[PDB]
Design a protein around this ligand. Structure first.
Ligand code: NA
Length: 227
């Protein structure tokens, strides 16, 4: 297909986020590459405004599902690649249980040969001494299933899923994700049957990096439709 042909090789990635959480203004820039054939991406993110005012794990889902490995028998259900190169808008509400809410708006699209994710994030009602603004979250990220359903009215998809962040006192911080994706092109796009993405992530640090940063390794495969 047109869209899927853009992802047969290794694709450079750029991520830019401007965020405002309880009045904290911050920016993040990420760079790396994605290999959708193997469902794998490698990225390094840097807070370009100084210290990140929220924990890095809380931004992982906001910081390119077009790099998911869709098995051959499922390629008919890969909305994300089918919207390319024109791209799609990805919007989310992320409700941290007993805490504040992120609202995000992003565009994911090709800018030349680079796949770019540009994000605006607004967070309100966060607890200044809670798990997020208090930086009480472990520096890791557990495996999740993202459940995707078509949204024929918007010619796009919706997704719902619950992220679980390990709190350093042993408890767990829930973050309910509500997600809507709309194509930017006028071209036709694949609308999928119900299915899910299975995601696994590894967070690390670059020892020679003095800025506040996150190295991210991610592995995503699609599933939920019988061969
Ligand atoms: Na372009």
């Amino acid at each position: 297909s047109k869209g899927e042909e853009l992802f047969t090789g290794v694709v450079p990635i750029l991520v830019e986020l401007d965020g405002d959480v309880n009045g904290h203004k911050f920016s993040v820039r990420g760079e790396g590459e994605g290999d959708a054939t193997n469902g794998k991406l490698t990225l390094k993110f840097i807070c370009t405004t100084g210290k990140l005012p929220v924990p890095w794990p809380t931004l992982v889902t906001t910081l390119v599902q077009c790099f998911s490995r869709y098995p051959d028998h499922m390629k008919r259900h890969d909305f994300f690649k089918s919207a390319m190169p024109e791209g799609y808008v990805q919007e989310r509400t992320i409700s941290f249980k007993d805490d504040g809410t992120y609202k995000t708006r992003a565009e994911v699209k090709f800018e030349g040969d680079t796949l770019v994710n540009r994000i605006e994030l607004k967070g309100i009602d966060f607890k200044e001494f809670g798990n997020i603004l208090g930086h009480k979250l472990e520096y890791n990220f557990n495996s999740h299933n993202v459940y995707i359903t078509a949204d024929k009215q918007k010619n796009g998809i919706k997704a719902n899923f619950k992220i679980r962040h390990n709190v350093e006192d042993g408890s767990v911080q829930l973050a309910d994700h509500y997600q809507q994706n709309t194509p930017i092109g006028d071209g036709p796009v694949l609308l999928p049957d119900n299915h899910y993405l299975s995601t696994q992530s590894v967070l690390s640090k670059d020892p020679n990096e003095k800025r506040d940063h996150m190295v991210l390794l991610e592995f995503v495969t699609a599933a939920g439709i019988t061969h």
